[PDB]
């Protein structure tokens, strides 16, 4: 037998290779004299068909194809945080450092984690020679960053008795930091573990999801809440906001780490993240720190090789499952599942597989299903119990903006949260451009148990706000054929209040300091004021329309113009400058001003 | 020379011993010499899209190659001719066969042989004189109006070894002999040109002079330049003849070419009946307009490739007259019928559909045709200017301009005389809707 075959043929990202008798499907191969990374996709006898993760231009018939004996795999360990990786897990910082080039050179083999760095390691102290150990046992902590205590753990396949655990000190990926024996066979281990990306990292139990993922944005956290461990999509046409929402969730959320996958995205988004994320800061323990310390990127920009979009997604979720097994509340952004599915379309078209709808492969549903189901909150493997999570947010980009798109249709089949954006809102510069009719969040029944403990006022307010916006969209279908005049005064109040909710709550200008972030206490306070206005304005009409002394929407407006201005101004309150108590006290004063103004109409 | 038929399926004829054959070469199939184009090669075998109905073609039948792709015979004897879309001469087919039918597999030479034309050699030339493509080596008096400038073919060059003296010569007489690189070329009045190739130029000039129609709305408010690209929404209710007849009688173009793109049988016979009877005043004499035109007529049941080629034939004729320094006007009375013929070829080639079922290359096949218009400095040495103006009608169903042939045409033509049934019903002739219509040449005509 030979460890290497020979290229029989090439067509775009697909290569066919001879002398491959004894290859396996999804085995990694190196193709060409430059050792282009690729993965076997079909077998046809002593011949393989291969998908190449690097541009095949210049590959020749009779080029070597070295079989690796390994599936597509990521090195997990210290040196992930703040990194940017390409789609097949090569750190772009070390590629740049080693080669001084503005471009990624084809066939480069930069090791996935920087093995020259000496990391600080603390062994778990409980473990000692002769101790029992199993996959997922946290055998030590590496102080990778000021934020992330990197819980090193035994790989999920590994188990045994501890032969040796290293003392506290400085180490790298070549050091035998741990050694086991099992069934009489010794097993050397180091703080870097390999895992196959197409395989799910196992867990003790997948737990029910019951804590909100506070995003940066009013409309999201109020009307369509995500949960930690939740599966979410952001389908939207070009230029809607989907990247800005994915940025905003990454910049401003309670996720303990973020893995951000630039799958087929415009390249400036990666430069935006690398420009902004070292400068933008969170705070912990009274110390300010750069948000990059909790983030990692997997880039694979739109002009990078098509095939690598698959590897990029699977890399991002493999990382996310690893940080989940440490017990961190991971979030995973994916800048578009449709641009992933276009890689699946291209490979299918090269293989000549039969398409389903719009050219997409028939397994598209199963690929997306086995992606989003890698989310959840989990009781991690191994000895110490942890409640990790991955929350997955796939920013689907439907061709033509049309949600009948098979990727959108399959995505909305799987995800529990659907934030459908709308180009009509983005044309109006109504951002975030979430359409609040077509969107939904299936987690709300589970999250009601959280709101009832921490925000007992919220569930009524969420309900009334959704209803008011719905009633205005019902009224609009009539207004578009009769004009603004024929409506009853209660319905005028509904329409105007819904316009205030649309313009001064749903909209949020994330490139301005006051709307850059919006905490939940600000969000609920704005709702309490807008709904208190609605109930009192409606009540004032209903109390008096039984008489000639009838209050009306115009009487309210002309008596309360300053209160309407105060109501619209609430968005400008800024948590960077204003304390929580200061914003709350201003909003409490607005509630008192409304009550005394309405008492002055009675 | 010839190959043999290996298989037949509908119009597709596979032939063998075709090892010498070329892509889009023109082949005669069967004992009846049916026309077709090679659409594929696969070794010593060729697949021929036969144009005419293949019923009766047999395995082992001869398959005679012409040494040429689909091509137009150019020369004297074009004026007054009627051609099908592949340059077969419908008047002479009629007069030789004495039949109401085109016989399947006509081989009648397109320019009539045996007519000794009156030829005057270009009196400046001598044995040993240098010559280049587009040099006018003599003039043929084919009709009173159109002195036919015989010219060296664009790819031929060298030294004149012989030129025929003044006299009467038919299209097969060797009028010129020339030599280059020690190789002699014998040359005739007939000249063969590949129909899908642009006849080259010294330079395509910017168009700068009106193509006067003699019609107030058309000349005043929506002018077309000599060399201009234009369209008309040719449909029954709008009175399309008001433009085309006015152009034919009066307009300032020295020659005219008509392409019947794929018109209804009776509507085709209207063109062919009418034009012989139309007349022009020239130098105070009255003469039939057939002295200055050729009608490339095609009914809807002419072969698909003839309808698809017919547009390219008409412009390839028009470019020869342009190279004689004449201003041609070319009418194309339904680009939509040509686009249907193009769609049928694509369907028979089993190619994938694009917009509304048309092929992907519809945009390119339209654009690369309209770019064959314009003013030019001709090839060859007497520095003469000339032009082709292309007046290509469109037929959007229900008037809907979103129809891809119509939309792509309006994406290319610089002038659109938007005739309208509402004006024609009121007899507001010339029936041009001035709100719909436009011209982009206004700027260029300012000079």
């Amino acid at each position: 037998e030979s460890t290497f075959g020979y290229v029989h043929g090439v067509s775009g990202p697909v290569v066919t290779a001879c002398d491959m008798a004894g290859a396996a499907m999804y085995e990694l191969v190196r193709v060409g004299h430059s050792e282009l990374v690729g993965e076997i996709i079909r077998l046809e006898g002593d011949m393989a068909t291969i998908q190449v993760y690097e541009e095949t231009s210049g590959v020749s018939v009779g080029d070597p194809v070295l079989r690796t004996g390994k599936p597509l795999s990521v090195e997990l360990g210290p040196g992930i945080m703040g990194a940017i990786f390409d789609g097949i897990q090569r750190p772009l910082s070390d590629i740049s450092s080693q080669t001084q080039s503005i471009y990624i050179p084809r066939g480069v083999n930069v090791s996935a984690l920087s093995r020259d760095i000496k990391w600080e390691f603390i062994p778990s102290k409980n473990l000692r020679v002769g101790s029992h150990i199993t996959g997922g046992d946290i055998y030590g902590i590496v102080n990778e960053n000021s934020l992330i205590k990197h819980k090193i753990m035994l790989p999920p396949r590994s188990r045994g008795s501890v032969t040796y655990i290293a003392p506290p000190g400085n180490y790298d990926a070549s050091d035998v930091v741990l050694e086991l024996e099992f069934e009489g066979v010794k097993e050397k281990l180091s703080m870097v573990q390999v895992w196959p990306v197409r395989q799910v990292r196992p867990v003790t139990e997948k737990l029910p999801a019951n804590h909100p993922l506070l995003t940066g944005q009013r409309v999201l956290d109020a009307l369509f809440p995500c949960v930690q461990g939740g599966t979410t999509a952001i389908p939207g046409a070009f230029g809607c906001g989907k990247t800005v929402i994915s940025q905003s969730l990454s910049k401003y959320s309670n996720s303990d780490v973020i893995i951000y996958v630039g799958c087929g995205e415009r390249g400036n988004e990666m430069s935006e993240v690398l420009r902004d994320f070292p400068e933008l800061t969170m705070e912990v323990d009274g110390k300010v720190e750069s948000i990059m310390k909790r983030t990692a990127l997997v880039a694979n920009t739109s002009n990078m090789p098509v095939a690598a979009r698959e590897a990029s997604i699977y890399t991002g979720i493999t990382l996310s499952e690893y940080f989940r097994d440490m017990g961190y509340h991971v979030s995973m952004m994916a800048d578009s599942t449709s641009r992933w599915a276009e890689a699946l379309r291209e490979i299918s078209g090269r293989l000549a597989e039969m398409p389903a709808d719009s050219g997409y492969p028939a397994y598209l549903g199963a690929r997306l299903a086995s992606f989003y189901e890698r989310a959840g909150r989990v009781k991690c493997l191994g000895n110490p119990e942890r409640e990790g999570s991955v929350s997955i947010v796939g920013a689907v980009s439907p061709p033509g903006g049309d949600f009948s798109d098979p990727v959108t249709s399959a995505t909305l089949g799987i995800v529990q949260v659907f934030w459908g954006l709308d180009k009509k809102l983005a044309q109006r510069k109504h951002f975030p451009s979430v359409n609040w009719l077509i969107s939904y969040s299936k987690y709300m029944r589970a999250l009601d148990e959280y709101y009832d403990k921490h925000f007992t006022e919220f569930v009524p307010l969420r309900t009334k706000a959704k209803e008011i916006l719905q009633e205005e969209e019902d009224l609009a279908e009539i207004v578009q054929l009769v004009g603004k005049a024929s409506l009853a005064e209660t319905d005028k109040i509904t329409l105007e209040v819904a316009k205030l909710i649309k313009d001064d709550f749903l909209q949020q200008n994330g490139y301005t300091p006051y709307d850059r972030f919006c905490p939940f206490y600000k969000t609920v306070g704005m709702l309490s004021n807008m709904i208190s206005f609605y109930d009192m304005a409606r009540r004032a009409v209903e109390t008096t329309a039984q008489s000639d002394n009838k209050i009306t929407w115009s009487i309210i407006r002309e008596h309360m113009g300053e209160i309407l201005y105060k109501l619209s101004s609430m968005k400008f309150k800024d948590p960077v400058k204003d304390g929580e108590a200061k914003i709350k006290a201003d909003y409490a004063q607005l509630l008192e001003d409304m009550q005394n103004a309405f008492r002055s109409l009675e | 020379t010839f190959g043999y038929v290996h298989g037949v399926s509908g119009p597709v004829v596979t032939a063998c011993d075709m090892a010498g054959a070329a892509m889009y070469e023109l082949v005669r199939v069967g004992h009846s010499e049916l026309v077709g184009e090679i659409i594929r090669l696969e070794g010593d075998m060729a697949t021929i899209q036969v144009y005419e109905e293949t019923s009766g073609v047999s395995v082992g039948d001869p398959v005679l190659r012409t040494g040429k792709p689909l091509s137009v015979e150019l020369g004297p004897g074009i004026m007054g001719a009627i051609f099908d879309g592949i340059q077969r001469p419908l008047s002479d087919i009629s007069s030789q066969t004495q039949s109401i039918y085109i016989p399947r597999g006509v081989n009648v030479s397109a320019l009539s042989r045996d007519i000794k034309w009156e030829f005057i050699p270009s009196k400046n030339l001598r044995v040993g004189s240098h010559i280049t493509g587009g040099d006018i080596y003599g003039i043929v008096n084919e009709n009173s109006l159109i002195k036919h400038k015989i010219m060296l073919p664009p790819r031929s060059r060298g030294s004149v070894t012989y030129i025929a003296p003044p006299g009467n010569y038919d299209a097969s007489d060797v009028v010129l002999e020339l030599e280059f690189e020690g190789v002699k070329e014998k040359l005739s009045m007939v000249q063969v040109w590949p129909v899908r190739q642009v006849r080259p130029v010294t330079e395509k000039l910017p168009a700068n002079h009106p193509l006067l129609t003699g019609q107030r709305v058309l000349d005043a408010l929506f002018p077309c330049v000599q060399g201009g690209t234009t369209a008309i929404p040719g449909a029954f209710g709008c009175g399309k003849t008001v433009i085309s007849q006015s152009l034919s009688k009066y307009s300032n173009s020295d020659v005219i070419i008509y392409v019947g793109c794929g018109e209804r049988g009776n509507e085709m016979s209207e063109v062919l009946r009418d034009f012989p009877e139309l007349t022009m005043e020239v130098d105070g004499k009255v003469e039939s307009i057939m002295k200055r035109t050729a009608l490339v007529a095609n009914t809807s049941n002419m072969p698909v490739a003839a309808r698809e080629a017919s547009i390219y034939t008409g412009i390839t004729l028009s470019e020869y007259f342009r190279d004689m320094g004449y201003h041609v006007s070319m009418m194309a009375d339904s680009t939509s019928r040509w686009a249907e013929a193009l769609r049928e070829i694509s369907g028979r080639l089993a190619e994938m559909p694009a917009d509304s079922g048309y092929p992907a290359y519809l945009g390119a096949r339209l654009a690369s045709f309209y770019e064959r218009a314009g003013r030019v400095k001709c090839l060859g040495n007497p520095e003469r200017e000339g032009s082709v103006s292309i007046v290509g009608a469109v037929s959007p169903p229900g008037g809907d301009f979103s129809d891809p042939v119509t939309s792509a045409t309006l994406g290319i033509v610089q002038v659109f005389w938007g005739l309208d049934k509402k004006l024609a019903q009121r007899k507001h002739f010339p029936s041009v809707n001035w709100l719909i219509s436009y011209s982009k040449y206004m700027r260029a005509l300012d000079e």
Partner: peptide
């Protein structure tokens, strides 16, 4: 149309291969 065309091409390949297998 595209699915039916690709099916038709695979059938022609299978027919050609089936005739070659007679040699």
């Amino acid at each position: 149309f595209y699915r039916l065309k690709k099916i038709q091409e695979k059938k022609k390949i299978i027919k050609e291969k089936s005739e070659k297998d007679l040699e």
